[PDB]
Subunit: 148 residues, 3 copies
């Protein structure tokens, strides 16, 4: 039950998640998500300056969890997810930070823990940008295949 | 209704004359990134938050959107082929202090809504700050657009 | 045209040994970003416009493209499966003065043309400068590729 894994992992993080999405031909295109928990943006700052690797991995986890919550609210259940085809990770960082892959692992492992080792497979790109909306540390967008 | 004439209006108000730029597959048009270039010259150059203020950046986002719409219109005759703008990626050449990427992307979004309507003009979007852009441009935007058959 | 043999010849000219990364859905292969890693080492590290000049940046873009083509060939046996490269996004680790993103991206585009032909190698493209890349790489490139099937 993916929805119950969702609840479990949100508790593990200590946060409570409760146009952003457009569907076409069985694919959901999702707007970029910063680490907002309808409170505000949780891990703001520049990775490698204000934000260390662990906090950036948490931020990526929150962005992914938010995307999953938007999916669930729109379709009722995370069972509709067939594959996360693409995940693009933009990291607000200094010019010396080289651990974009580890920040992105913060999001990928959320995918695995909620969707399984099969359905949680995804392509990904992970780059450093010089700034983000509202001084966020991470922004992530998705293309997700849906079951019909 | 008349998306082509709403386009003509925006072109007139801006005062400009609007690898492969566009490829279609399975009813989707993929569009190359567009910097704010009309004629041959790049219209709004510089770093947002330094050389380019918010209003100029919104104008740049508009010019890039206009370029993409013109490419669609040139390839299909009319903007009536547009069913939905599935995705718009906005890359903003800015300082390390600029945090108003959403307001910059609004320059593109508002054009989409005015020309196509609130239904067909719906789009997901990502808007991030980058370190530099081709030819020192201030904004670059690419699109995935669903087409009517 | 035999793309696998073109690939080998181009691999020889470049002097590197290219011999989840990929997911297919509805005839499209989505590919993860590729840094210029051949064997297990990143080949052209540094900041374009600082440590890395234009010619080396183009080489790095070539290596990333070659890596994606190799991933395609090993996953499907032959590059004959490629119908079109729908989209190529090029991220360039550069200084704030570098404005030749198009010329770097030409490094990737030309590999596609040499190996896939002027028809199948056509692609849309986006090319922006970023502040850093995994493992201090100079270029990173992702792809969306349509397949024949």
């Amino acid at each position: 039950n993916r929805d119950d894994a969702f609840l479990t992992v949100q508790a593990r993080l200590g946060y409570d998640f409760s146009t952003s999405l457009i569907e076409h031909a069985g694919l959901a295109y999702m707007s970029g998500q910063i680490p907002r928990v309808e409170d505000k943006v949780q891990v703001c700052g520049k990775v490698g300056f204000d934000v260390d690797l662990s906090q950036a991995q948490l931020a990526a986890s929150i962005s992914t969890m938010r995307a999953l919550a938007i999916l669930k609210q729109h379709y009722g259940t995370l069972q509709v997810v067939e594959k996360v085809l693409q995940m693009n990770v933009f990291i607000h960082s200094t010019a010396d930070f080289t651990q974009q892959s580890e920040v992105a692992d913060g999001a990928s492992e959320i995918l695995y823990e909620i969707l399984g080792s099969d359905t949680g497979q995804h392509t990904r790109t992970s780059v450093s940008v010089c700034q983000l909306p509202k001084n966020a540390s991470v922004e992530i967008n998705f293309i997700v295949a849906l079951k019909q």
